Amino acid sequence: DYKAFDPELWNAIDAEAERQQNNIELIASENVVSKAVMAAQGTLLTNKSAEGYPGKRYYGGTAVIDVVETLAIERAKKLFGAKFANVQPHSGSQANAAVYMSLIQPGDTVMGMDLSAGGHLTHGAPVSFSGKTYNFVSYNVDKESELLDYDAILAQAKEVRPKLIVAGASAYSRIIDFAKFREIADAVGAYLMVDMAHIAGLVASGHHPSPVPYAHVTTTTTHKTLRGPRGGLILTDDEDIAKKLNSAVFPGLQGGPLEHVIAAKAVALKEALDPAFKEYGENVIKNAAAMADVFNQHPDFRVISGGTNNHLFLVDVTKVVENGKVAQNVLEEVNITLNKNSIPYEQLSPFKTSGIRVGSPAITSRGMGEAESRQIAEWMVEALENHDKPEVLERIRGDVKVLTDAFPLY
Amino acid sequence: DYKAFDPELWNAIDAEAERQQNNIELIASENVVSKAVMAAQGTLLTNKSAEGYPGKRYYGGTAVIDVVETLAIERAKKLFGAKFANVQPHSGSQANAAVYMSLIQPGDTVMGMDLSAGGHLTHGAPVSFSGKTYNFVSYNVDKESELLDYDAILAQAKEVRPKLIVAGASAYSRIIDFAKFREIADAVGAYLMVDMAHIAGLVASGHHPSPVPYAHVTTTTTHKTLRGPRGGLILTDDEDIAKKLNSAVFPGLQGGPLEHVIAAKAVALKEALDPAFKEYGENVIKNAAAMADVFNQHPDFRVISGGTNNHLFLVDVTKVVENGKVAQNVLEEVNITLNKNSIPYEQLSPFKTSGIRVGSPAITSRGMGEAESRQIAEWMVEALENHDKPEVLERIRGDVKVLTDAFPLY
Numbered sequence: 001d002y003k004a005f006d007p008e009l010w011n012a013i014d015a016e017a018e019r020q021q022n023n024i025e026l027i028a029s030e031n032v033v034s035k036a037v038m039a040a041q042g043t044l045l046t047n048k049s050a051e052g053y054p055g056k057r058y059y060g061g062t063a064v065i066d067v068v069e070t071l072a073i074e075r076a077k078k079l080f081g082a083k084f085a086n087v088q089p090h091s092g093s094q095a096n097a098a099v100y101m102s103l104i105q106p107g108d109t110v111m112g113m114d115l116s117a118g119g120h121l122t123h124g125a126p127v128s129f130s131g132k133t134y135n136f137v138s139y140n141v142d143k144e145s146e147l148l149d150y151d152a153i154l155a156q157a158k159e160v161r162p163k164l165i166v167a168g169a170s171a172y173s174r175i176i177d178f179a180k181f182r183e184i185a186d187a188v189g190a191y192l193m194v195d196m197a198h199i200a201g202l203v204a205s206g207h208h209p210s211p212v213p214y215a216h217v218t219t220t221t222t223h224k225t226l227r228g229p230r231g232g233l234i235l236t237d238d239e240d241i242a243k244k245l246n247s248a249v250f251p252g253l254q255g256g257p258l259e260h261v262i263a264a265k266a267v268a269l270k271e272a273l274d275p276a277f278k279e280y281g282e283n284v285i286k287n288a289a290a291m292a293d294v295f296n297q298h299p300d301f302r303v304i305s306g307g308t309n310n311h312l313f314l315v316d317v318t319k320v321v322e323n324g325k326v327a328q329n330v331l332e333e334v335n336i337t338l339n340k341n342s343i344p345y346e347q348l349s350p351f352k353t354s355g356i357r358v359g360s361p362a363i364t365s366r367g368m369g370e371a372e373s374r375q376i377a378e379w380m381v382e383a384l385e386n387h388d389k390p391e392v393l394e395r396i397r398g399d400v401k402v403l404t405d406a407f408p409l410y
Numbered sequence: 411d412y413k414a415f416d417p418e419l420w421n422a423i424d425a426e427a428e429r430q431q432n433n434i435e436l437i438a439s440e441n442v443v444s445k446a447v448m449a450a451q452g453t454l455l456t457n458k459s460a461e462g463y464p465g466k467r468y469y470g471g472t473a474v475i476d477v478v479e480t481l482a483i484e485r486a487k488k489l490f491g492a493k494f495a496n497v498q499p500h501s502g503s504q505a506n507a508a509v510y511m512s513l514i515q516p517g518d519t520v521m522g523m524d525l526s527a528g529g530h531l532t533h534g535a536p537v538s539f540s541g542k543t544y545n546f547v548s549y550n551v552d553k554e555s556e557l558l559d560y561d562a563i564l565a566q567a568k569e570v571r572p573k574l575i576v577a578g579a580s581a582y583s584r585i586i587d588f589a590k591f592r593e594i595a596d597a598v599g600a601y602l603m604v605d606m607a608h609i610a611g612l613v614a615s616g617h618h619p620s621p622v623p624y625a626h627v628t629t630t631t632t633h634k635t636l637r638g639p640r641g642g643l644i645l646t647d648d649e650d651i652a653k654k655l656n657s658a659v660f661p662g663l664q665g666g667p668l669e670h671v672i673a674a675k676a677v678a679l680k681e682a683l684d685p686a687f688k689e690y691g692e693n694v695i696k697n698a699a700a701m702a703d704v705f706n707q708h709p710d711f712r713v714i715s716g717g718t719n720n721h722l723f724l725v726d727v728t729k730v731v732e733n734g735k736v737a738q739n740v741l742e743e744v745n746i747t748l749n750k751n752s753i754p755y756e757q758l759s760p761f762k763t764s765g766i767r768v769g770s771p772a773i774t775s776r777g778m779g780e781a782e783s784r785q786i787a788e789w790m791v792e793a794l795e796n797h798d799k800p801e802v803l804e805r806i807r808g809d810v811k812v813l814t815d816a817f818p819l820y
């Protein structure tokens with residue numbers, strides 16, 4: 001029917017479905033959404049423009065849109081224990097931009113986690129609007145432990161006097177002490193924003209402490225560990241802040257929201273409020289720990305910080321291949337996607353890096369367990385140690401295909 | 411059976427589908443997308459992170475995503491005749507922000523169409539990031555003709571000396587001369603950006619002159635007259651601006667793109683390349699002109715500029731009801747949604763306005779013709795003359811149901 005009209009597009013979508021089936025996805029930001037989240041996004045709510053907020057719309061015909069957006073807001077509030085939520089940001093970048101716009105002025109100093117240790121692009125990369133508009137100053141982990149050192153972060157905050165401190169990371173494997181971050185913010189009179197995008201599903205699942213009681217404002221993506229549609233979310237307990245956030249999102253940065261994506265956010269948040277989501281989060285944690293253990297045991301690989309207590313970890317591969325870029329290329333030859341990744345105090349260039357980052361959420365959402373996870377990391381050790389032996393990669397490829405065959409994506 | 415898990419969300423979606431069926435949508439921005447466009451947005455492409463651009467991605471496993479985005483880009487180029495396209499902006503607001511980031515600096519002077527005569531929020535409203543970051547000075551239409559006066563705009567531009575002139579409007583009913591806008595820009599050394607979001611479908615259908623050969627950069631939404639999914643699009647013929655635009659969208663303003671929405675853009679652009687789309691645009695123009703004609707003939711109503719040559723028009727309602735806010739609330743009683751709208755040189759407050767805006771794209775997409783269009787406008791005239799009279803509104807609401815029943819939405 002509708003696909004006969006555009007075979008080039010619809011065939012490419014079948015190819016991507018098959019590609020996702022035959023791939024072992026370890027990119028730590030990826031997940032596998034439910035059928036219901038996809039269907040929500042494919043509905044006729046896309047036809048209706050909803051500029052404004054529930055009960056305060058520009059346009060009539062919005063009573064039902066209002067029920068759907070209210071459901072998203074109420075479920076975010078319930079799941080994360082916050083008194084206000086805004087479900088309109090189109091992305092995590094828009095969510096973060098709305099928060100800077102609400103709490104600080106162009107030119108103010110912001111402290112964020114060093115891009116080599118886990119900081120996101122929107123936490124002050126010079127190539128980001130973040131870096132261009134505000135004065136970002138980065139904090140790092142300790143050189144020797146590779147852990148956050150809250151005394152060192154406090155001593156830097158006293159020198160730099162930020163207006164806003166950002167906590168959260170895309171490559172930190174350990175539990176963040178949000179209460180200490182709020183104590184640091186308090187000691188220098190800064191706001192604390194936490195970007196929980198990478199860990200939000202473990203926060204919902206109960207496996208990572210919540211930032212919501214400690215941060216002035218919490219942002220997140222609805223995708224990644226929370227396993228929702230791609231989009232943003234902002235949370236706060238402060239009603240004056242909530243009103244600034246609302247105006248910064250619309251009409252400050254966006255026009256009307258994507259109400260079909262907001263319906264998919266409502267669906268994903270009810271999935272996360274279900275008891276099975278806690279089990280999901282336990283398996284994320286155990287799968288990641290099983291893979292990190294293979295690299296820990298092995299003499300030629302070091303895990304940054306020695307391990308993980310979340311969904312991901314970094315590995316210094318440089319004793320085995322030249323750089324993380326090479327490691328990423330080799331593993332792509334066996335149907336395993338991950339990303340090269342700077343390690344703390346990274347010596348090589350950003351385009352090479354000394355490391356890979358590995359995450360467990362996608363394989364976990366396909367039903368894989370600890371045994372599979374250990375096996376995948378054993379395959380990665382093999383392929384990297386044998387990168388210039390085409391015979392070997394070929395056999396690992398065939399092994400990988402038996403595994404993917406056994407854990408159907410959908 | 412996913413709906414049985416969340417009946418509250420899925421019941422709300424069935425309610426909006428029914429509400430859309432029973433509504434006569436005349437909000438000039440709205441449309442009714444195809445089933446193919448909705449289906450595309452509901453695919454597993456949401457799972458795949460595609461930071462970067464085709465062949466230049468942060469991550470592997472992206473070869474097929476590259477085919478999908480390349481199709482969108484190529485179809486946009488071909489539909490609009492542009493040498494470069496970027497299909498990743500999440501909205502029209504992010505498209506425009508990326509253009510301003512690429513062409514000018516914070517604090518520079520920008521001329522845009524006055525917000526009472528049709529300039530968009532992102533062309534300088536003080537509540538927008540646009541208005542807060544840049545110095546916007548507006549041009550207007552001539553007071554007597556309500557037409558753009560290109561001589562008067564040149565004289566103003568010579569005084570103001572903007573770095574950037576923005577053309578495009580959300581409420582201007584007549585054909586814009588983009589060649590003259592570019593001659594004005596060239597005469598004062600400004601860039602020209604055209605936001606063609608409202609008219610993009612008419613540009614595509616052949617019914618409105620293309621800005622693409624004249625603007626340095628053209629932005630649009632993919633929704634509205636173009637009848638695609640919600641999102642943005644940028645076009646340019648200058649390779650050096652293309653490069654700056656690409657960096658501005660990512661990583662300047664956004665993270666990774668919504669690839670499932672990009673597939674839906676590819677779908678909508680192929681629909682618009684088809685000969686049937688020219689017939690759609692013809693109907694859009696005739697339907698709008700039939701509804702304007704009812705208000706033109708009637709003595710108590712005045713159409714701004716005396717009529718229309720696009721998808722929309724404005725009506726000064728103030729001889730019949732107090733303000734356009736009242737007119738919007740009255741017509742919602744009879745299942746007709748439109749929006750109040752400032753008219754040029756508006757005397758009332760922006761919360762009330764002297765006018766309504768009416769557009770044809772949505773009713774046109776449901777198959778209505780000139781006879782139905784004229785009938786709907788006669789109903790609006792009756793409802794507004796009888797706004798006081800609940801039993802008249804009741805009768806009109808029954809008549810609207812007969813017509814909506816006869817023109818099924820999907």
Ligand SMILES: C[C@H](O)[C@@H](N)C(=O)O
Nearest residue numbers: 091092093664665666
């Ligand atoms: C902005 C966006 O949501 C980003 N965090 C990403 O995953 O692409």
Ligand SMILES: C[C@H](O)[C@@H](N)C(=O)O
Nearest residue numbers: 254255256501502503
């Ligand atoms: C930013 C956005 O796309 C605006 N033009 C709208 O339709 O909502």
